[PDB]
Structures are given as C-alpha cells and as structure tokens.
Amino acid sequence: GSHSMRYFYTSVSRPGRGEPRFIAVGYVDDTQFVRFDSDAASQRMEPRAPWIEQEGPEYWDRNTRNVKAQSQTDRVDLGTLRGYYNQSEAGSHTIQMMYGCDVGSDGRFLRGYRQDAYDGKDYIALKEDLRSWTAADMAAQTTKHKWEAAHVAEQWRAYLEGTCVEWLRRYLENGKETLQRTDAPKTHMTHHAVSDHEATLRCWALSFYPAEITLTWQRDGEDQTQDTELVETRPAGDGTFQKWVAVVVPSGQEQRYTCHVQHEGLPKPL
Amino acid sequence: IQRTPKIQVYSRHPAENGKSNFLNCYVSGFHPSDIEVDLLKNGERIEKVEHSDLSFSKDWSFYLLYYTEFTPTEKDEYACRVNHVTLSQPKIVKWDRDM
Numbered sequence: 001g002s003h004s005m006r007y008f009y010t011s012v013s014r015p016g017r018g019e020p021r022f023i024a025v026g027y028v029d030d031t032q033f034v035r036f037d038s039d040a041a042s043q044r045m046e047p048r049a050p051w052i053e054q055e056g057p058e059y060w061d062r063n064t065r066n067v068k069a070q071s072q073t074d075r076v077d078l079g080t081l082r083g084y085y086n087q088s089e090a091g092s093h094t095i096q097m098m099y100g101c102d103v104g105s106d107g108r109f110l111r112g113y114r115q116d117a118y119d120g121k122d123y124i125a126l127k128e129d130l131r132s133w134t135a136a137d138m139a140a141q142t143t144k145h146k147w148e149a150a151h152v153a154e155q156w157r158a159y160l161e162g163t164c165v166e167w168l169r170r171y172l173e174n175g176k177e178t179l180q181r182t183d184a185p186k187t188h189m190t191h192h193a194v195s196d197h198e199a200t201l202r203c204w205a206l207s208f209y210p211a212e213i214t215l216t217w218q219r220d221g222e223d224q225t226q227d228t229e230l231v232e233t234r235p236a237g238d239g240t241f242q243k244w245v246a247v248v249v250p251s252g253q254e255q256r257y258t259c260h261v262q263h264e265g266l267p268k269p270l
Numbered sequence: 271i272q273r274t275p276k277i278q279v280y281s282r283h284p285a286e287n288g289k290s291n292f293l294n295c296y297v298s299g300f301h302p303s304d305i306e307v308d309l310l311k312n313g314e315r316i317e318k319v320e321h322s323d324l325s326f327s328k329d330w331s332f333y334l335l336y337y338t339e340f341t342p343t344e345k346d347e348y349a350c351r352v353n354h355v356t357l358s359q360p361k362i363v364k365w366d367r368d369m
Contacts, residue, residue: 025324032325237294
C-alpha cells in the first residue's frame with residue numbers, strides 16, 4: 001500500500017512572558033515516531049516509536065537543530081504576520097505547518113505537500129506541482145512574493161521528492177513489523193433498549209490500524225442513515241483506533257440491520 | 271478563528287468493573303490550542319493524568335488525548351471537564367461505558 005511521512009508544527013505566541021510554545025510531531029502514516037516540545041526538558045527531538053531509536057547521534061542532532069531553527073523562524077514570523085494583519089502585541093496567535101510526502105507500494109514518490117496556517121486558517125500552501133504557491137489573502141501574498149524572489153519552492157520540492165521519500169522508505173523497512181502491518185478492526189454489535197419496543201444497536205470497530213475506516217448500517221440490504229449516529233474515529237491510546245455507528249431500530253426487527261465495515265486490513269470488506 | 275472542542279470520554283478497553291483499564295478524554299476540533307482538560311472521579315480531579323503531543327486535523331483544528339489508568343466500578347462516576355475560550359463555563363461530559 002501507499003505510505004506517507006508527515007511533520008506537524010505549531011507555534012503559539014506567549015505575550016505575557018517569554019517566547020512562543022513550539023510543538024513538532026512526526027508521523028509515518030498513523031504512527032507518531034518523533035516529537036519536540038519547547039516546554040520539555042531535553043530540548044531535543046525525542047523518539048516516540050521503538051524503530052527510530054536505533055538512529056545515531058547526528059540523526060538526533062540534525063533533527064534537533066532543524067526543528068529548533070524552525071521554532072525561531074516561527075518566532076520571527078509571528079512578529080511579521082502580527083504586523084501584516086495590523087494586530088496588537090497583546091494577543092496570542094498561532095502558526096501551524098504540515099508537510100510531507102507519500103509513496104506508493106513500490107516506494108516511489110507519489111506526492112509532496114507543505115502548507116501552513118495563521119490562527120487556524122490557511123495562510124500559504126505549496127501547490128501539488130511543488131513549483132508554485134497559493135496565498136489565501138494579501139498578507140500571505142506578501143510572503144508569496146518574497147518566496148518567489150528567493151526560490152523557496154525549489155528547496156521544498158528537492159526535499160519532498162528526495163530526502164522525505166528516502167527516509168520514509170528507510171523507516172518503512174526499519175519498523176516494518178508494525179508499519180507494514182494492518183490491524184483489521186475487531187468488531188461486535190451491542191443492543192441497548194431505549195424503551196419496551198425500541199432499541200439502539202451499536203456497531204463497534206476496535207483496535208484497528210490504520211485509522212481510515214468506513215462503518216455503515218444497511219436495513220434489508222440498503223444503506224440507512226436516518227436514526228443513525230456515527231462517532232469521530234478516536235485513538236485507543238495504544239497506537240490503534242476505535243469507531244462506532246449506532247441505529248435506533250424497532251425491537252424485534254434487529255435481523256433486518258447489518259453493519260458493514262470497510263478497512264485496509266480486510267480483503268474485500270462488507 | 272475560534273472553534274469549540276468536540277469531546278469523547280471512553281475507556282481504552284471493554285470496561286469490566288473491578289478491572290484496571292485507561293480512561294480517555296479525546297478533545298478535538300478546537301482552535302486555539304490552549305485548553306484545560308481534567309479527568310474526574312466522583313467530581314474530584316485525578317492527579318497523574320497524561321496527554322498526547324499536540325497535533326491537528328486537515329482544517330487546522332487541534333486534538334489531544336488525555337488519559338489515566340482507572341478501574342471501572344458500579345458506583346464511581348468518571349467524567350471529563352474541559353475549559354476553552356469558546357466555552358462560557360467548563361463542559362463536563364460523564365463517562366458512559368456503552369459509548
């Protein structure tokens with residue numbers, strides 16, 4: 001299957017005292033494997049999956065240096081963007097950035113991406129061509145002019161099509177025993193009476209990996225969405241995920257309802 | 271922009287009274303990232319509650335998992351108490367083991 005490596009950065013200015021909070025986490029597909037938190041003790045990029053542990057000292061030095069320089073660039077940029085939007089030095093603001101690459105089943109680059117946000121809204125994004133920028137407003141347009149002049153897109157493209165893809169293939173071979181394994185959902189249904197003639201049937205998908213899943217109810221072979229409730233997929237806290245969908249049914253009529261589960265860990269789900 | 275948290279309180283494993291398990295509070299869909307999440311037993315605050323490293327979804331809204339080891343019982347009430355700029359008072363969501 002295809003695989004992705006993604007890094008997520010968040011900087012939050014702290015106007016009352018100090019510098020911004022900066023948190024960075026890296027993922028291979030849905031497995032977090034590194035983190036940096038400016039409020040933590042190490043002041044180092046830290047391992048979060050057993051298979052990255054083996055990386056030598058320069059790996060950890062270079063990754064620590066990189067994500068520290070990014071926190072300082074974000075510190076400056078919080079100042080800059082505050083100026084662009086003409087906002088006061090009193091309020092706290094946020095820059096977030098997500099970047100990464102996907103590879104297909106043979107490990108070749110499929111796509112790269114790098115986009116950021118200012119206070120939870122799109123600010124500037126690298127297009128899929130990895131050559132040009134999408135500026136959401138006029139402050140990001142100013143950034144887009146500076147970056148076209150400096151040919152910043154070129155550097156991102158070289159990283160996303162090279163380094164990003166090379167290390168993701170390395171990680172995939174190194175943590176293959178979990179990263180290239182699917183944990184199909186363990187499923188069961190529960191029945192809860194809602195009165196002396198209605199009941200909720202809840203269909204549970206538990207302990208699965210990757211997180212992507214589709215849970216749906218059919219009544220007599222046709223998809224039902226009325227009287228159903230679908231929760232947001234949530235982490236189990238052990239690297240796997242959970243989801244359920246429920247329907248309210250007339251008691252006695254439960255055999256008409258089937259829950260249909262679709263997940264990568266399943267050969268032809270239904 | 272500001273966005274209010276979604277909240278799910280649930281155990282990591284099937285809850286069985288008397289068996290040790292983990293209580294989770296998943297807060298997601300919120301912006302800004304500053305938030306206060308407490309896990310509660312019979313109204314009091316549990317002390318060594320842990321959380322994941324802040325990350326966010328495609329629409330840039332954040333999520334965090336708060337968790338602590340616990341044992342479900344017949345009479346203890348567990349809940350998650352969340353406070354955020356978008357809320358005029360803290361939101362308390364009681365743990366229901368069926369969801």
